Amino acid sequence: SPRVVRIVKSESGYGFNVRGQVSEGGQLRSINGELYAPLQHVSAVLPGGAADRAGVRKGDRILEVNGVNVEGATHKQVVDLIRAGEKELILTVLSV
């Protein structure tokens, strides 16, 4: 089920990598049996980093960034949203 995590940036960043499609939209793919448009996901978590401590997990799919729905979003849209805040990031994620 979707959950919200708050992550405070360190000087070296949030401590995770995001990976996913360049383009907008695309074929539906269910995540834990629920239909969604394509989602960007967390492809790495820095051990001991901010994301790790906040409970972000490898493979987490990203549904919202800073209160903005990113279902079907381009990679650039999600990166730009993650970078929107000076030091805080709020994600809605789905663990797989």
Binding site: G13, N17, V18, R19, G20, Q21, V22, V79
Partner: peptide, 7 residues
């Protein structure tokens, strides 16, 4: 096509 970024 997929891209990865370090955040």
């Amino acid at each position: 096509e997929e891209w990865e970024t370090v955040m």
